[PDB]
Design a protein around this ligand. Sequence first.
Ligand SMILES: COc1cc([C@@H](CC(=O)O)c2ccc(C)c(CN3C[C@@H](C)Oc4ccccc4S3(=O)=O)c2)cc2nnn(C)c12
Ligand SMILES: [Cl-]
Length: 288
Amino acid sequence: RLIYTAGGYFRQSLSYLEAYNPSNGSWLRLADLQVPRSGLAGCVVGGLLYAVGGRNNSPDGNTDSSALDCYNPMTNQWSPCASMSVPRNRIGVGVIDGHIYAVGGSHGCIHHSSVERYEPERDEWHLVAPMLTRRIGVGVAVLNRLLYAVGGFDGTNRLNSAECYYPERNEWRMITPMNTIRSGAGVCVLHNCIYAAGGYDGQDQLNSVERYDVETETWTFVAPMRHHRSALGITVHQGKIYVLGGYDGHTFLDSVECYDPDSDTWSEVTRMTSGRSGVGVAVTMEPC
Ligand SMILES: COc1cc([C@@H](CC(=O)O)c2ccc(C)c(CN3C[C@@H](C)Oc4ccccc4S3(=O)=O)c2)cc2nnn(C)c12
Ligand SMILES: [Cl-]
């Protein structure tokens, strides 16, 4: 029912949790994160919203986060969960069969290839097989109970490469690379395709959008977004992609755009209450 945006960055890391309602255009401000964080990811398991990793960039210092925190819309409260094995800033996450996969990200100058999986029933993290590539600012999506890690930055180069994790083999394999180098792209799934929207290539923030068809193993460009943006939040709500904020090399954007795959068009839907980048985004039910 609602698109939740958690944390992000403008001047410093943010604690905001706000929920947008596509049905009426309204934004609600909800309970702040306990710790400000940018470069985190959001996901939903069993109706609960999780905020994963990131970094607190504050005037008092810069601290990468290994934190997992859970928001209950029914109570409007955040609860701490078990922390990850390592801090993971500029993280990507995916959910498969009620488990959260935390992928890549940085801890200071360490750019992680490691991956770990959270089991809400046990409140436990366990490492799984590492990716073949170190990736921070990595886009993650899940399609047909397979996990995809797309683009990012390896410590030296921004990447067009992507790879797939096969849970029952505990194994990563490269897939077809994207046609575009993208770090901090928005990555999501819609129908049978993984979409990669925007990002940064070391020179420019991008408006281009391409999608990987798992059946054909090829990437194809769709219509570009109205705004160039890196470190955007992205989610799917009722068969449409929504992209939230990000950075265009000039402004921390408040723009929210929506993609209709049937007309292959992007349109402006709303503005966030303030411009920000590096948010975590996910969809769950209305609070209380
Ligand atoms: C080094 O410059 C950049 C890096 C990244 C990547 C990382 C890389 O490729 O080296 C990236 C990917 C994901 C995330 C979340 C971030 C960090 N966030 C975006 C940046 C532009 O804004 C800031 C600034 C300060 C603190 C935190 C953030 S962020 O919103 O979390 C970067 C994206 C950029 N877009 N414009 N510039 C100048 C960028
Ligand atoms: Cl950062």
